[PDB]
mmCIF file with all atom_site columns, C-alpha atoms and ligand atoms in Angstrom:
data_model
loop_
_atom_site.group_PDB
_atom_site.id
_atom_site.type_symbol
_atom_site.label_atom_id
_atom_site.label_alt_id
_atom_site.label_comp_id
_atom_site.label_asym_id
_atom_site.label_entity_id
_atom_site.label_seq_id
_atom_site.pdbx_PDB_ins_code
_atom_site.Cartn_x
_atom_site.Cartn_y
_atom_site.Cartn_z
_atom_site.occupancy
_atom_site.B_iso_or_equiv
_atom_site.pdbx_formal_charge
_atom_site.auth_seq_id
_atom_site.auth_comp_id
_atom_site.auth_asym_id
_atom_site.auth_atom_id
_atom_site.pdbx_PDB_model_num
ATOM   1   C  CA  . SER L 1 1   ? -111.475 -78.786  30.891 1.00 0.00 ? 1   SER L CA  1
ATOM   2   C  CA  . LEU L 1 2   ? -114.411 -76.890  29.410 1.00 0.00 ? 2   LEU L CA  1
ATOM   3   C  CA  . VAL L 1 3   ? -117.084 -78.609  28.109 1.00 0.00 ? 3   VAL L CA  1
ATOM   4   C  CA  . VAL L 1 4   ? -119.735 -76.147  26.171 1.00 0.00 ? 4   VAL L CA  1
ATOM   5   C  CA  . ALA L 1 5   ? -122.991 -77.332  24.654 1.00 0.00 ? 5   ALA L CA  1
ATOM   6   C  CA  . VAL L 1 6   ? -124.815 -75.300  21.706 1.00 0.00 ? 6   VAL L CA  1
ATOM   7   C  CA  . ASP L 1 7   ? -128.190 -76.718  20.901 1.00 0.00 ? 7   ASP L CA  1
ATOM   8   C  CA  . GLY L 1 8   ? -131.016 -75.030  18.789 1.00 0.00 ? 8   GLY L CA  1
ATOM   9   C  CA  . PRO L 1 9   ? -133.066 -75.804  15.503 1.00 0.00 ? 9   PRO L CA  1
ATOM   10  C  CA  . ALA L 1 10  ? -131.231 -75.492  12.200 1.00 0.00 ? 10  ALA L CA  1
ATOM   11  C  CA  . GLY L 1 11  ? -130.264 -71.519  10.851 1.00 0.00 ? 11  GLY L CA  1
ATOM   12  C  CA  . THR L 1 12  ? -129.790 -70.099  13.998 1.00 0.00 ? 12  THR L CA  1
ATOM   13  C  CA  . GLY L 1 13  ? -126.240 -69.187  13.439 1.00 0.00 ? 13  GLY L CA  1
ATOM   14  C  CA  . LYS L 1 14  ? -125.680 -72.166  15.267 1.00 0.00 ? 14  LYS L CA  1
ATOM   15  C  CA  . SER L 1 15  ? -122.524 -73.494  13.368 1.00 0.00 ? 15  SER L CA  1
ATOM   16  C  CA  . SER L 1 16  ? -120.567 -70.366  12.940 1.00 0.00 ? 16  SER L CA  1
ATOM   17  C  CA  . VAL L 1 17  ? -121.381 -69.416  16.390 1.00 0.00 ? 17  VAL L CA  1
ATOM   18  C  CA  . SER L 1 18  ? -119.828 -73.082  17.732 1.00 0.00 ? 18  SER L CA  1
ATOM   19  C  CA  . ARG L 1 19  ? -116.786 -72.735  15.854 1.00 0.00 ? 19  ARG L CA  1
ATOM   20  C  CA  . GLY L 1 20  ? -116.710 -69.144  16.729 1.00 0.00 ? 20  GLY L CA  1
ATOM   21  C  CA  . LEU L 1 21  ? -116.958 -69.919  20.439 1.00 0.00 ? 21  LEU L CA  1
ATOM   22  C  CA  . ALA L 1 22  ? -114.185 -73.005  19.944 1.00 0.00 ? 22  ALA L CA  1
ATOM   23  C  CA  . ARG L 1 23  ? -112.118 -70.766  17.589 1.00 0.00 ? 23  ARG L CA  1
ATOM   24  C  CA  . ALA L 1 24  ? -111.853 -68.040  20.475 1.00 0.00 ? 24  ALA L CA  1
ATOM   25  C  CA  . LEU L 1 25  ? -111.610 -70.675  23.586 1.00 0.00 ? 25  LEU L CA  1
ATOM   26  C  CA  . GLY L 1 26  ? -108.669 -72.668  21.586 1.00 0.00 ? 26  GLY L CA  1
ATOM   27  C  CA  . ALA L 1 27  ? -111.201 -75.904  21.811 1.00 0.00 ? 27  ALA L CA  1
ATOM   28  C  CA  . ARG L 1 28  ? -111.884 -78.532  19.817 1.00 0.00 ? 28  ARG L CA  1
ATOM   29  C  CA  . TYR L 1 29  ? -115.158 -78.491  17.937 1.00 0.00 ? 29  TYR L CA  1
ATOM   30  C  CA  . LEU L 1 30  ? -117.432 -81.314  17.488 1.00 0.00 ? 30  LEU L CA  1
ATOM   31  C  CA  . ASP L 1 31  ? -120.226 -81.101  14.836 1.00 0.00 ? 31  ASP L CA  1
ATOM   32  C  CA  . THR L 1 32  ? -122.437 -84.189  16.022 1.00 0.00 ? 32  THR L CA  1
ATOM   33  C  CA  . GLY L 1 33  ? -124.921 -83.295  13.054 1.00 0.00 ? 33  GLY L CA  1
ATOM   34  C  CA  . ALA L 1 34  ? -121.676 -83.836  10.753 1.00 0.00 ? 34  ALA L CA  1
ATOM   35  C  CA  . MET L 1 35  ? -121.380 -87.327  12.326 1.00 0.00 ? 35  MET L CA  1
ATOM   36  C  CA  . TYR L 1 36  ? -125.359 -88.503  11.594 1.00 0.00 ? 36  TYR L CA  1
ATOM   37  C  CA  . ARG L 1 37  ? -124.701 -87.357  8.246  1.00 0.00 ? 37  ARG L CA  1
ATOM   38  C  CA  . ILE L 1 38  ? -121.702 -89.356  7.641  1.00 0.00 ? 38  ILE L CA  1
ATOM   39  C  CA  . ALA L 1 39  ? -123.433 -92.304  8.774  1.00 0.00 ? 39  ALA L CA  1
ATOM   40  C  CA  . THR L 1 40  ? -126.191 -91.276  6.457  1.00 0.00 ? 40  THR L CA  1
ATOM   41  C  CA  . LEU L 1 41  ? -123.654 -91.376  3.229  1.00 0.00 ? 41  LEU L CA  1
ATOM   42  C  CA  . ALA L 1 42  ? -122.497 -94.793  4.760  1.00 0.00 ? 42  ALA L CA  1
ATOM   43  C  CA  . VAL L 1 43  ? -126.064 -96.291  4.710  1.00 0.00 ? 43  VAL L CA  1
ATOM   44  C  CA  . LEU L 1 44  ? -126.709 -94.816  1.245  1.00 0.00 ? 44  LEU L CA  1
ATOM   45  C  CA  . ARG L 1 45  ? -123.222 -96.120  -0.010 1.00 0.00 ? 45  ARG L CA  1
ATOM   46  C  CA  . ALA L 1 46  ? -124.307 -99.416  1.208  1.00 0.00 ? 46  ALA L CA  1
ATOM   47  C  CA  . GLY L 1 47  ? -127.262 -99.551  -0.196 1.00 0.00 ? 47  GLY L CA  1
ATOM   48  C  CA  . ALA L 1 48  ? -129.260 -100.444 2.737  1.00 0.00 ? 48  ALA L CA  1
ATOM   49  C  CA  . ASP L 1 49  ? -133.209 -100.649 3.083  1.00 0.00 ? 49  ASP L CA  1
ATOM   50  C  CA  . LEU L 1 50  ? -134.424 -97.184  4.545  1.00 0.00 ? 50  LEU L CA  1
ATOM   51  C  CA  . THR L 1 51  ? -137.190 -98.938  5.788  1.00 0.00 ? 51  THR L CA  1
ATOM   52  C  CA  . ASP L 1 52  ? -135.472 -101.270 7.656  1.00 0.00 ? 52  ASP L CA  1
ATOM   53  C  CA  . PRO L 1 53  ? -133.951 -100.237 10.640 1.00 0.00 ? 53  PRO L CA  1
ATOM   54  C  CA  . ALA L 1 54  ? -131.578 -103.227 11.591 1.00 0.00 ? 54  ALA L CA  1
ATOM   55  C  CA  . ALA L 1 55  ? -130.286 -102.841 7.721  1.00 0.00 ? 55  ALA L CA  1
ATOM   56  C  CA  . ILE L 1 56  ? -129.650 -99.183  8.888  1.00 0.00 ? 56  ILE L CA  1
ATOM   57  C  CA  . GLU L 1 57  ? -128.207 -99.879  11.957 1.00 0.00 ? 57  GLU L CA  1
ATOM   58  C  CA  . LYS L 1 58  ? -125.686 -102.632 10.379 1.00 0.00 ? 58  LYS L CA  1
ATOM   59  C  CA  . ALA L 1 59  ? -124.605 -99.984  7.562  1.00 0.00 ? 59  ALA L CA  1
ATOM   60  C  CA  . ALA L 1 60  ? -123.889 -97.362  9.879  1.00 0.00 ? 60  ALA L CA  1
ATOM   61  C  CA  . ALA L 1 61  ? -122.311 -99.889  12.351 1.00 0.00 ? 61  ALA L CA  1
ATOM   62  C  CA  . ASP L 1 62  ? -119.608 -100.700 9.733  1.00 0.00 ? 62  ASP L CA  1
ATOM   63  C  CA  . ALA L 1 63  ? -119.048 -97.050  9.215  1.00 0.00 ? 63  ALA L CA  1
ATOM   64  C  CA  . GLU L 1 64  ? -115.600 -95.347  10.234 1.00 0.00 ? 64  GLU L CA  1
ATOM   65  C  CA  . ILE L 1 65  ? -116.454 -92.183  11.006 1.00 0.00 ? 65  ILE L CA  1
ATOM   66  C  CA  . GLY L 1 66  ? -114.321 -89.256  11.505 1.00 0.00 ? 66  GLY L CA  1
ATOM   67  C  CA  . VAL L 1 67  ? -114.985 -85.505  12.038 1.00 0.00 ? 67  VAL L CA  1
ATOM   68  C  CA  . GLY L 1 68  ? -112.320 -82.524  12.496 1.00 0.00 ? 68  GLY L CA  1
ATOM   69  C  CA  . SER L 1 69  ? -111.895 -81.111  15.674 1.00 0.00 ? 69  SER L CA  1
ATOM   70  C  CA  . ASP L 1 70  ? -110.395 -78.184  14.230 1.00 0.00 ? 70  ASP L CA  1
ATOM   71  C  CA  . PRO L 1 71  ? -113.181 -75.489  13.950 1.00 0.00 ? 71  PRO L CA  1
ATOM   72  C  CA  . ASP L 1 72  ? -111.147 -73.646  11.421 1.00 0.00 ? 72  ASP L CA  1
ATOM   73  C  CA  . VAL L 1 73  ? -111.670 -76.167  8.756  1.00 0.00 ? 73  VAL L CA  1
ATOM   74  C  CA  . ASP L 1 74  ? -114.690 -77.899  7.088  1.00 0.00 ? 74  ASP L CA  1
ATOM   75  C  CA  . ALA L 1 75  ? -113.708 -81.832  7.478  1.00 0.00 ? 75  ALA L CA  1
ATOM   76  C  CA  . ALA L 1 76  ? -115.643 -84.872  7.374  1.00 0.00 ? 76  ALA L CA  1
ATOM   77  C  CA  . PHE L 1 77  ? -114.611 -88.130  6.705  1.00 0.00 ? 77  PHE L CA  1
ATOM   78  C  CA  . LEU L 1 78  ? -115.374 -91.599  6.035  1.00 0.00 ? 78  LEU L CA  1
ATOM   79  C  CA  . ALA L 1 79  ? -112.900 -94.448  6.028  1.00 0.00 ? 79  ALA L CA  1
ATOM   80  C  CA  . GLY L 1 80  ? -110.451 -91.807  5.285  1.00 0.00 ? 80  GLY L CA  1
ATOM   81  C  CA  . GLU L 1 81  ? -112.044 -90.199  2.321  1.00 0.00 ? 81  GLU L CA  1
ATOM   82  C  CA  . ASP L 1 82  ? -112.967 -86.460  2.549  1.00 0.00 ? 82  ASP L CA  1
ATOM   83  C  CA  . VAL L 1 83  ? -116.995 -86.274  2.135  1.00 0.00 ? 83  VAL L CA  1
ATOM   84  C  CA  . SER L 1 84  ? -117.043 -82.498  3.514  1.00 0.00 ? 84  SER L CA  1
ATOM   85  C  CA  . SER L 1 85  ? -118.823 -81.795  0.401  1.00 0.00 ? 85  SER L CA  1
ATOM   86  C  CA  . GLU L 1 86  ? -120.737 -84.617  -0.577 1.00 0.00 ? 86  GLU L CA  1
ATOM   87  C  CA  . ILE L 1 87  ? -122.498 -84.742  3.308  1.00 0.00 ? 87  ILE L CA  1
ATOM   88  C  CA  . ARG L 1 88  ? -123.727 -81.451  3.024  1.00 0.00 ? 88  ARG L CA  1
ATOM   89  C  CA  . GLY L 1 89  ? -125.233 -82.501  -0.323 1.00 0.00 ? 89  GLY L CA  1
ATOM   90  C  CA  . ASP L 1 90  ? -128.888 -83.063  -1.092 1.00 0.00 ? 90  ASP L CA  1
ATOM   91  C  CA  . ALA L 1 91  ? -129.243 -87.255  -1.134 1.00 0.00 ? 91  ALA L CA  1
ATOM   92  C  CA  . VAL L 1 92  ? -127.742 -87.201  2.514  1.00 0.00 ? 92  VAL L CA  1
ATOM   93  C  CA  . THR L 1 93  ? -130.259 -83.943  3.663  1.00 0.00 ? 93  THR L CA  1
ATOM   94  C  CA  . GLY L 1 94  ? -132.864 -86.325  2.174  1.00 0.00 ? 94  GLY L CA  1
ATOM   95  C  CA  . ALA L 1 95  ? -131.995 -89.370  4.004  1.00 0.00 ? 95  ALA L CA  1
ATOM   96  C  CA  . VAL L 1 96  ? -130.255 -88.157  7.255  1.00 0.00 ? 96  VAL L CA  1
ATOM   97  C  CA  . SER L 1 97  ? -133.859 -87.860  8.828  1.00 0.00 ? 97  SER L CA  1
ATOM   98  C  CA  . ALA L 1 98  ? -134.428 -91.606  8.451  1.00 0.00 ? 98  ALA L CA  1
ATOM   99  C  CA  . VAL L 1 99  ? -130.933 -92.694  9.302  1.00 0.00 ? 99  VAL L CA  1
ATOM   100 C  CA  . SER L 1 100 ? -130.917 -90.499  12.485 1.00 0.00 ? 100 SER L CA  1
ATOM   101 C  CA  . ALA L 1 101 ? -134.358 -91.905  13.426 1.00 0.00 ? 101 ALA L CA  1
ATOM   102 C  CA  . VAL L 1 102 ? -133.238 -95.208  14.480 1.00 0.00 ? 102 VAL L CA  1
ATOM   103 C  CA  . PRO L 1 103 ? -132.407 -96.067  17.926 1.00 0.00 ? 103 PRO L CA  1
ATOM   104 C  CA  . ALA L 1 104 ? -129.314 -98.230  17.368 1.00 0.00 ? 104 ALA L CA  1
ATOM   105 C  CA  . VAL L 1 105 ? -127.597 -95.252  15.218 1.00 0.00 ? 105 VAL L CA  1
ATOM   106 C  CA  . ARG L 1 106 ? -128.451 -92.781  17.933 1.00 0.00 ? 106 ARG L CA  1
ATOM   107 C  CA  . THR L 1 107 ? -126.824 -95.150  20.855 1.00 0.00 ? 107 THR L CA  1
ATOM   108 C  CA  . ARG L 1 108 ? -123.890 -95.342  18.895 1.00 0.00 ? 108 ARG L CA  1
ATOM   109 C  CA  . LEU L 1 109 ? -123.237 -92.126  17.841 1.00 0.00 ? 109 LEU L CA  1
ATOM   110 C  CA  . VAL L 1 110 ? -124.057 -90.331  21.535 1.00 0.00 ? 110 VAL L CA  1
ATOM   111 C  CA  . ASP L 1 111 ? -121.435 -92.946  23.314 1.00 0.00 ? 111 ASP L CA  1
ATOM   112 C  CA  . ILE L 1 112 ? -118.805 -91.822  20.600 1.00 0.00 ? 112 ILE L CA  1
ATOM   113 C  CA  . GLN L 1 113 ? -119.919 -88.033  21.510 1.00 0.00 ? 113 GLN L CA  1
ATOM   114 C  CA  . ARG L 1 114 ? -119.821 -88.541  25.402 1.00 0.00 ? 114 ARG L CA  1
ATOM   115 C  CA  . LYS L 1 115 ? -116.204 -90.143  25.115 1.00 0.00 ? 115 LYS L CA  1
ATOM   116 C  CA  . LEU L 1 116 ? -114.985 -87.630  22.688 1.00 0.00 ? 116 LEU L CA  1
ATOM   117 C  CA  . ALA L 1 117 ? -116.122 -84.825  25.044 1.00 0.00 ? 117 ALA L CA  1
ATOM   118 C  CA  . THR L 1 118 ? -113.545 -86.290  27.491 1.00 0.00 ? 118 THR L CA  1
ATOM   119 C  CA  . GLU L 1 119 ? -110.419 -86.634  25.493 1.00 0.00 ? 119 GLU L CA  1
ATOM   120 C  CA  . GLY L 1 120 ? -108.857 -83.630  26.996 1.00 0.00 ? 120 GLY L CA  1
ATOM   121 C  CA  . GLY L 1 121 ? -109.103 -79.933  27.350 1.00 0.00 ? 121 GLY L CA  1
ATOM   122 C  CA  . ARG L 1 122 ? -111.930 -77.615  25.900 1.00 0.00 ? 122 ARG L CA  1
ATOM   123 C  CA  . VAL L 1 123 ? -114.508 -78.887  23.354 1.00 0.00 ? 123 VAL L CA  1
ATOM   124 C  CA  . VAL L 1 124 ? -117.823 -77.005  22.084 1.00 0.00 ? 124 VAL L CA  1
ATOM   125 C  CA  . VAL L 1 125 ? -120.289 -80.029  20.982 1.00 0.00 ? 125 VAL L CA  1
ATOM   126 C  CA  . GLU L 1 126 ? -123.063 -78.612  18.453 1.00 0.00 ? 126 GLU L CA  1
ATOM   127 C  CA  . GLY L 1 127 ? -126.258 -80.721  18.305 1.00 0.00 ? 127 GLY L CA  1
ATOM   128 C  CA  . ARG L 1 128 ? -130.089 -80.881  19.241 1.00 0.00 ? 128 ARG L CA  1
ATOM   129 C  CA  . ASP L 1 129 ? -130.025 -82.483  22.686 1.00 0.00 ? 129 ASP L CA  1
ATOM   130 C  CA  . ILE L 1 130 ? -126.136 -82.045  23.676 1.00 0.00 ? 130 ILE L CA  1
ATOM   131 C  CA  . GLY L 1 131 ? -127.355 -79.945  27.070 1.00 0.00 ? 131 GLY L CA  1
ATOM   132 C  CA  . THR L 1 132 ? -130.343 -82.221  27.621 1.00 0.00 ? 132 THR L CA  1
ATOM   133 C  CA  . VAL L 1 133 ? -129.341 -85.585  26.811 1.00 0.00 ? 133 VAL L CA  1
ATOM   134 C  CA  . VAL L 1 134 ? -125.651 -86.640  25.472 1.00 0.00 ? 134 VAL L CA  1
ATOM   135 C  CA  . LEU L 1 135 ? -123.607 -83.970  28.118 1.00 0.00 ? 135 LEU L CA  1
ATOM   136 C  CA  . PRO L 1 136 ? -126.358 -83.079  30.846 1.00 0.00 ? 136 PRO L CA  1
ATOM   137 C  CA  . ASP L 1 137 ? -123.299 -81.802  32.997 1.00 0.00 ? 137 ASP L CA  1
ATOM   138 C  CA  . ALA L 1 138 ? -121.937 -79.729  30.507 1.00 0.00 ? 138 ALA L CA  1
ATOM   139 C  CA  . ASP L 1 139 ? -119.879 -76.679  31.918 1.00 0.00 ? 139 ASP L CA  1
ATOM   140 C  CA  . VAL L 1 140 ? -121.738 -74.214  29.629 1.00 0.00 ? 140 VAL L CA  1
ATOM   141 C  CA  . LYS L 1 141 ? -125.319 -74.677  27.740 1.00 0.00 ? 141 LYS L CA  1
ATOM   142 C  CA  . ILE L 1 142 ? -126.522 -72.561  25.327 1.00 0.00 ? 142 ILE L CA  1
ATOM   143 C  CA  . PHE L 1 143 ? -129.535 -72.863  23.094 1.00 0.00 ? 143 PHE L CA  1
ATOM   144 C  CA  . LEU L 1 144 ? -129.987 -70.630  20.551 1.00 0.00 ? 144 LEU L CA  1
ATOM   145 C  CA  . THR L 1 145 ? -133.264 -69.666  18.802 1.00 0.00 ? 145 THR L CA  1
ATOM   146 C  CA  . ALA L 1 146 ? -134.386 -67.179  15.992 1.00 0.00 ? 146 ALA L CA  1
ATOM   147 C  CA  . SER L 1 147 ? -137.808 -66.696  14.027 1.00 0.00 ? 147 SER L CA  1
ATOM   148 C  CA  . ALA L 1 148 ? -138.672 -69.316  11.322 1.00 0.00 ? 148 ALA L CA  1
ATOM   149 C  CA  . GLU L 1 149 ? -138.354 -66.454  8.675  1.00 0.00 ? 149 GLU L CA  1
ATOM   150 C  CA  . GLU L 1 150 ? -134.784 -65.441  10.171 1.00 0.00 ? 150 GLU L CA  1
ATOM   151 C  CA  . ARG L 1 151 ? -133.843 -68.850  10.054 1.00 0.00 ? 151 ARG L CA  1
ATOM   152 C  CA  . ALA L 1 152 ? -135.088 -69.362  6.585  1.00 0.00 ? 152 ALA L CA  1
ATOM   153 C  CA  . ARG L 1 153 ? -133.276 -66.151  5.607  1.00 0.00 ? 153 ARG L CA  1
ATOM   154 C  CA  . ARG L 1 154 ? -130.141 -67.765  6.804  1.00 0.00 ? 154 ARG L CA  1
ATOM   155 C  CA  . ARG L 1 155 ? -130.473 -71.067  4.986  1.00 0.00 ? 155 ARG L CA  1
ATOM   156 C  CA  . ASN L 1 156 ? -131.257 -69.442  1.587  1.00 0.00 ? 156 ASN L CA  1
ATOM   157 C  CA  . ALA L 1 157 ? -128.499 -66.993  2.016  1.00 0.00 ? 157 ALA L CA  1
ATOM   158 C  CA  . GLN L 1 158 ? -125.995 -69.735  2.256  1.00 0.00 ? 158 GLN L CA  1
ATOM   159 C  CA  . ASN L 1 159 ? -127.581 -71.766  -0.418 1.00 0.00 ? 159 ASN L CA  1
ATOM   160 C  CA  . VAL L 1 160 ? -127.092 -68.777  -2.841 1.00 0.00 ? 160 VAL L CA  1
ATOM   161 C  CA  . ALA L 1 161 ? -123.754 -68.469  -0.916 1.00 0.00 ? 161 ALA L CA  1
ATOM   162 C  CA  . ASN L 1 162 ? -122.987 -72.182  -2.066 1.00 0.00 ? 162 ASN L CA  1
ATOM   163 C  CA  . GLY L 1 163 ? -124.019 -71.195  -6.092 1.00 0.00 ? 163 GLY L CA  1
ATOM   164 C  CA  . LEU L 1 164 ? -127.474 -73.070  -5.423 1.00 0.00 ? 164 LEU L CA  1
ATOM   165 C  CA  . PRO L 1 165 ? -130.856 -71.226  -6.389 1.00 0.00 ? 165 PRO L CA  1
ATOM   166 C  CA  . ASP L 1 166 ? -132.668 -68.225  -4.600 1.00 0.00 ? 166 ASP L CA  1
ATOM   167 C  CA  . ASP L 1 167 ? -135.577 -69.574  -3.363 1.00 0.00 ? 167 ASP L CA  1
ATOM   168 C  CA  . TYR L 1 168 ? -136.363 -68.098  -0.025 1.00 0.00 ? 168 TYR L CA  1
ATOM   169 C  CA  . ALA L 1 169 ? -140.522 -69.237  -0.254 1.00 0.00 ? 169 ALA L CA  1
ATOM   170 C  CA  . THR L 1 170 ? -139.211 -72.894  -0.857 1.00 0.00 ? 170 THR L CA  1
ATOM   171 C  CA  . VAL L 1 171 ? -136.690 -72.753  2.302  1.00 0.00 ? 171 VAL L CA  1
ATOM   172 C  CA  . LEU L 1 172 ? -139.315 -71.118  4.495  1.00 0.00 ? 172 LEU L CA  1
ATOM   173 C  CA  . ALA L 1 173 ? -142.022 -73.986  3.867  1.00 0.00 ? 173 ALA L CA  1
ATOM   174 C  CA  . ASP L 1 174 ? -139.530 -76.271  4.573  1.00 0.00 ? 174 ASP L CA  1
ATOM   175 C  CA  . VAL L 1 175 ? -138.341 -74.748  7.907  1.00 0.00 ? 175 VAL L CA  1
ATOM   176 C  CA  . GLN L 1 176 ? -142.101 -74.539  8.556  1.00 0.00 ? 176 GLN L CA  1
ATOM   177 C  CA  . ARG L 1 177 ? -142.988 -78.369  7.760  1.00 0.00 ? 177 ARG L CA  1
ATOM   178 C  CA  . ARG L 1 178 ? -139.466 -79.466  9.939  1.00 0.00 ? 178 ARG L CA  1
ATOM   179 C  CA  . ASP L 1 179 ? -140.596 -77.269  12.737 1.00 0.00 ? 179 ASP L CA  1
ATOM   180 C  CA  . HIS L 1 180 ? -144.203 -78.971  12.679 1.00 0.00 ? 180 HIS L CA  1
ATOM   181 C  CA  . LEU L 1 181 ? -142.849 -82.731  12.307 1.00 0.00 ? 181 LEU L CA  1
ATOM   182 C  CA  . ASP L 1 182 ? -140.334 -81.636  15.255 1.00 0.00 ? 182 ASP L CA  1
ATOM   183 C  CA  . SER L 1 183 ? -143.382 -81.032  17.412 1.00 0.00 ? 183 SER L CA  1
ATOM   184 C  CA  . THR L 1 184 ? -145.361 -84.420  16.350 1.00 0.00 ? 184 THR L CA  1
ATOM   185 C  CA  . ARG L 1 185 ? -142.762 -86.864  15.307 1.00 0.00 ? 185 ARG L CA  1
ATOM   186 C  CA  . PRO L 1 186 ? -139.165 -85.649  17.367 1.00 0.00 ? 186 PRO L CA  1
ATOM   187 C  CA  . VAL L 1 187 ? -136.592 -88.216  17.462 1.00 0.00 ? 187 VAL L CA  1
ATOM   188 C  CA  . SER L 1 188 ? -135.324 -86.866  20.752 1.00 0.00 ? 188 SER L CA  1
ATOM   189 C  CA  . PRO L 1 189 ? -135.825 -84.126  22.969 1.00 0.00 ? 189 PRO L CA  1
ATOM   190 C  CA  . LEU L 1 190 ? -135.693 -80.801  21.170 1.00 0.00 ? 190 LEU L CA  1
ATOM   191 C  CA  . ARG L 1 191 ? -135.662 -77.956  23.754 1.00 0.00 ? 191 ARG L CA  1
ATOM   192 C  CA  . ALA L 1 192 ? -133.130 -75.772  26.042 1.00 0.00 ? 192 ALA L CA  1
ATOM   193 C  CA  . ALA L 1 193 ? -131.989 -77.745  29.169 1.00 0.00 ? 193 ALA L CA  1
ATOM   194 C  CA  . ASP L 1 194 ? -133.356 -75.855  32.413 1.00 0.00 ? 194 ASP L CA  1
ATOM   195 C  CA  . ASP L 1 195 ? -129.647 -74.496  32.993 1.00 0.00 ? 195 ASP L CA  1
ATOM   196 C  CA  . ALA L 1 196 ? -128.935 -73.338  29.680 1.00 0.00 ? 196 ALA L CA  1
ATOM   197 C  CA  . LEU L 1 197 ? -128.596 -69.598  28.282 1.00 0.00 ? 197 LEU L CA  1
ATOM   198 C  CA  . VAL L 1 198 ? -131.438 -69.080  25.476 1.00 0.00 ? 198 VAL L CA  1
ATOM   199 C  CA  . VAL L 1 199 ? -130.682 -66.614  22.983 1.00 0.00 ? 199 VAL L CA  1
ATOM   200 C  CA  . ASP L 1 200 ? -132.869 -65.490  20.624 1.00 0.00 ? 200 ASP L CA  1
ATOM   201 C  CA  . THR L 1 201 ? -130.268 -64.460  17.564 1.00 0.00 ? 201 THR L CA  1
ATOM   202 C  CA  . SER L 1 202 ? -133.101 -62.978  15.431 1.00 0.00 ? 202 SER L CA  1
ATOM   203 C  CA  . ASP L 1 203 ? -131.842 -59.564  14.951 1.00 0.00 ? 203 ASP L CA  1
ATOM   204 C  CA  . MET L 1 204 ? -128.012 -60.170  15.993 1.00 0.00 ? 204 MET L CA  1
ATOM   205 C  CA  . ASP L 1 205 ? -124.686 -61.027  13.864 1.00 0.00 ? 205 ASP L CA  1
ATOM   206 C  CA  . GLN L 1 206 ? -123.547 -63.982  14.662 1.00 0.00 ? 206 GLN L CA  1
ATOM   207 C  CA  . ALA L 1 207 ? -120.153 -62.087  15.690 1.00 0.00 ? 207 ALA L CA  1
ATOM   208 C  CA  . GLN L 1 208 ? -122.233 -60.229  18.427 1.00 0.00 ? 208 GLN L CA  1
ATOM   209 C  CA  . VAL L 1 209 ? -123.482 -63.486  19.303 1.00 0.00 ? 209 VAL L CA  1
ATOM   210 C  CA  . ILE L 1 210 ? -120.351 -65.104  19.547 1.00 0.00 ? 210 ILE L CA  1
ATOM   211 C  CA  . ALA L 1 211 ? -118.816 -62.121  21.780 1.00 0.00 ? 211 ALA L CA  1
ATOM   212 C  CA  . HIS L 1 212 ? -121.752 -61.943  24.095 1.00 0.00 ? 212 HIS L CA  1
ATOM   213 C  CA  . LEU L 1 213 ? -121.156 -65.630  24.871 1.00 0.00 ? 213 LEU L CA  1
ATOM   214 C  CA  . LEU L 1 214 ? -117.060 -64.970  25.459 1.00 0.00 ? 214 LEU L CA  1
ATOM   215 C  CA  . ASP L 1 215 ? -118.176 -62.462  27.972 1.00 0.00 ? 215 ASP L CA  1
ATOM   216 C  CA  . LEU L 1 216 ? -120.184 -64.878  30.011 1.00 0.00 ? 216 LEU L CA  1
ATOM   217 C  CA  . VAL L 1 217 ? -117.375 -67.905  29.909 1.00 0.00 ? 217 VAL L CA  1
HETATM 218 CL CL1 . CL  A 2 .   ? -128.744 -78.976  9.289  1.00 0.00 ? 1   CL  A CL1 1
#
């Protein structure tokens, strides 16, 4: 019945680590970020006024959101359609902060996440405040951190690996800017639970992180 929480800022190796843990543990994998991104895609498709929280709420409420629970596959669904690729595109990336900010959007998705966490057997749940807000009684809580530079290196290498432009300076500026806005305009708690393992992954390979964590479970 193990519930595992994996939190931290983007580019720390968080998704690779969560899927790796889930793969190794024979657990379901719940990418909560993807769920916000799918909601965001529904909001964009609806034409909902992004300055109107009630319009955003309505469009996202109406969305039939599915995330694949299999760590070995990239699967995101909106009303049956495979949107895995699109939810990682520029439009969704740009809008997801606005959609995620709306309290009724979070309330809905948090409740779904809590229910999915008890569906049966093992589950690794990835996010920003899984350990502190969504699943405070999770059995294992992990918070991953790394320097801004290493987070940018990773995120830029991922862009390049996706045929996207190689622009480390721009990605670092973005990581820095989002760090700043997390500290002045956060939309949720963002720090490690007091009962979380805190891992600086700056000089470790994702496989080493997964392996060290497996040794502790
Ligand atoms: Cl992200």
